[PDB]
């Protein structure tokens, strides 16, 4: 009868098989998840089975678990990600919803395993579908209190933005206008603020510079004047007009106590004149 050498190796069975009388056969070669590689998984005859003297048994050595290479399917939709996964035999698949800033909504932001051989069985894909950004709402805190108003937004994770303009009718410190509000939008966007500096109620100056032109084919340059002074942070231009001879401009300039004032004057982008004023 046939003896048992099921997981064990070829040169362990051909010494059962010959002290019992038999010869090893033929050696074939198959995929298995059950037995580590070059372990017998199989005979024929299979163990206890009717045999002669002499006969031959036959034997199947793994090859060890069937692999495949893993598939990059991140940033891909659910369906063509799974698709993508079964089309190589890879099925056992666990989805995971997670909120993400790199996929839309529905899209895969992250495999279990690294696009590496995998075995096609007992596998454990993980892949991490996209929820989107998480959505947080945006509290509408038009004519209420700008430090309130940031504080509040700063603790729900929102950046924060503000100009100020004056205002007739909304006590300093409190909000002119917001954008967004009444909403839920990304966590972490940036909501933008218009805030009362209370009303329009320093110095005066009106500087000259006389500005050269310098234009070719009697085409006229730009002149953009620059000012930084108590309203104005010379962020864009207080003055915007085209030249095409020297002219002398003037420049208004207020100015607070214990502090200076400043014109830039560019023409076609290069900066031609500038001057610091202190409130003098
Ligand atoms: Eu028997
Ligand atoms: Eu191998
Ligand atoms: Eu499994
Ligand atoms: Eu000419």
Same mark, same amino acid.
């Given at each position: 009868? !046939?003896?048992?050498?099921?997981?064990?190796?070829?040169?362990?069975?051909?010494?059962?098989?010959?002290?019992?009388?038999?010869?090893?056969?033929?050696?074939?070669?198959?995929?298995?998840?059950?037995?580590?590689?070059?372990?017998?998984?199989?005979?024929?005859?299979?163990?206890?089975?009717?045999?002669? #003297?002499?006969?031959?048994?036959?034997?199947?050595?793994?090859?060890?678990?069937?692999?495949?290479?893993?598939?990059?399917?991140?940033?891909?939709?659910?369906?063509?990600?799974?698709?993508?996964?079964?089309?190589?035999?890879?099925?056992?698949?666990?989805?995971?919803?997670?909120? =993400?800033?790199?996929?839309?909504?529905?899209?895969? *932001? =992250?495999?279990?395993?690294? *696009? !590496?051989?995998?075995?096609?069985?007992?596998?454990?894909?993980?892949?991490?579908?996209?929820?989107?950004?998480?959505?947080?709402?945006?509290?509408?805190?038009?004519?209420?209190?700008?430090?309130?108003?940031?504080?509040?937004?700063?603790?729900?994770?929102?950046?924060?933005?503000?100009?100020?303009?004056?205002?007739?009718?909304?006590?300093?410190?409190?909000?002119?206008?917001?954008?967004?509000?009444?909403?839920?939008?990304?966590?972490?966007?940036?909501?933008?603020?218009?805030?009362?500096?209370?009303?329009?109620?320093?110095?005066?100056?009106?500087?000259?510079?006389?500005?050269?032109?310098?234009?070719? =084919?009697?085409?006229?340059?730009?002149?953009?004047?620059?000012?930084?002074?108590?309203? =104005?942070?010379?962020?864009?231009?207080?003055?915007?007009?085209?030249?095409?001879?020297?002219?002398?401009?003037?420049?208004?300039? #207020?100015?607070?106590?214990?502090?200076?004032?400043?014109?830039?004057?560019?023409?076609?982008?290069?900066?031609? *004149?500038?001057?610091?004023?202190?409130?003098?």
């Amino acid at each position: 009868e !046939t003896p048992d050498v099921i997981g064990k190796s070829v040169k362990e069975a051909e010494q059962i098989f010959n002290k019992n009388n038999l010869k090893l056969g033929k050696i074939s070669r198959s995929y298995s998840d059950k037995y580590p590689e070059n372990e017998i998984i199989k005979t024929t005859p299979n163990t206890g089975e009717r045999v002669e #003297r002499g006969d031959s048994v036959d034997v199947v050595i793994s090859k060890g678990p069937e692999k495949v290479k893993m598939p990059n399917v991140i940033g891909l939709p659910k369906e063509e990600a799974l698709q993508k996964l079964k089309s190589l035999g890879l099925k056992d698949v666990t989805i995971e919803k997670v909120y =993400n800033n790199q996929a839309p909504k529905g899209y895969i *932001a =992250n495999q279990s395993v690294t *696009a !590496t051989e995998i075995a096609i069985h007992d596998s454990n894909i993980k892949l991490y579908e996209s929820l989107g950004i998480k959505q947080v709402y945006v509290e509408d805190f038009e004519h209420k209190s700008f430090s309130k108003a940031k504080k509040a937004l700063e603790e729900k994770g929102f950046k924060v933005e503000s100009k100020e303009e004056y205002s007739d009718d909304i006590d300093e410190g409190d909000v002119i206008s917001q954008s967004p509000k009444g909403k839920s939008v990304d966590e972490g966007s940036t909501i933008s603020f218009v805030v009362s500096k209370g009303k329009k109620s320093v110095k005066t100056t009106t500087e000259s510079v006389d500005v050269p032109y310098t234009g070719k =084919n009697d085409k006229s340059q730009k002149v953009k004047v620059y000012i930084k002074d108590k309203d =104005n942070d010379g962020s864009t231009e207080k003055g915007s007009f085209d030249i095409t001879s020297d002219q002398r401009i003037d420049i208004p300039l #207020r100015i607070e106590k214990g502090k200076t004032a400043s014109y830039i004057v560019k023409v076609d982008g290069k900066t031609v *004149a500038e001057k610091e004023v202190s409130y003098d």
